[PDB]
Design a protein around this ligand. Structure first.
Ligand SMILES: [Zn+2]
Ligand SMILES: [Zn+2]
Lengths: 121, 120
RNA sequence: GACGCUAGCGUC
RNA sequence: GACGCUAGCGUC
């Protein structure tokens, strides 16, 4: 099934977002739309910011819970956007209908409705 | 179908899948003296005990300018046999020449004959 | 060897 | 972020 699911912080199990809000960039990197998600993480400047492809890595992002702060990925400037790029190995996927939890390590293995990124949203 | 194993670094022939035997559905060895000629052994720098056999030596390609790490040599029951890691080799289908790079034994599906003490 | 983990480095 | 490579540590 490619039904909607929620991502929970792997360390504290707090809700982070839903698969409906996830968008794919270059069929390789995954970001999250919406302002609600922006409240769920904090950023911190990247100690070794490197550049590659079409965007620029500025900071790492972590769980906003002060009792977690699990590494969630990075924040990058892509074209004219400042957007979060998350790594799936930092989360637990939960199916909304059953509660079943899955621990993935790479995005290639997680098969869900991978809605491509739309600059208009 | 039968396949041969080549050294990942220099592509030298190591053995054929027909000679491979599985111990406790988890560790892979090879029978016959021909294979014994293709590798050299070396006392393991971190020997240790687990399950039913002791890790005594590290083994490497005998070809010297290659010397690619192939695994270890162990004492298992009344035999001392080599145990190899597929990640150190290229699998080539003999009929087609197609070369395959595996990382884990779980992924290479072939006739996995269990080790039998009466042979070798 | 079979798996897991930490650190570091390299490419777009 | 996505891969890739080292080194070390642990378990059986
Ligand atoms: Zn958390
Ligand atoms: Zn070799």
């Amino acid at each position: 099934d490619k039904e909607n699911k929620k991502l929970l912080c792997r360390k504290c199990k707090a809700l982070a977002c839903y698969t409906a809000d996830v968008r794919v960039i270059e069929e390789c990197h995954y970001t999250v739309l919406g302002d609600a998600f922006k409240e769920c993480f904090v950023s911190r400047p990247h100690p070794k910011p490197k550049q590659f492809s079409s965007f620029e890595k500025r900071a790492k992002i972590f769980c906003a819970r002060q009792n977690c702060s699990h590494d969630w990925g990075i924040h990058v400037k892509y074209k004219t956007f400042e957007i979060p790029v998350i790594k799936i190995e930092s989360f637990v996927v939960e199916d909304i209908a059953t509660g079943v939890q899955t621990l993935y390590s790479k995005w290639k293995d997680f098969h869900f409705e991978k809605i491509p990124f739309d600059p208009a949203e």
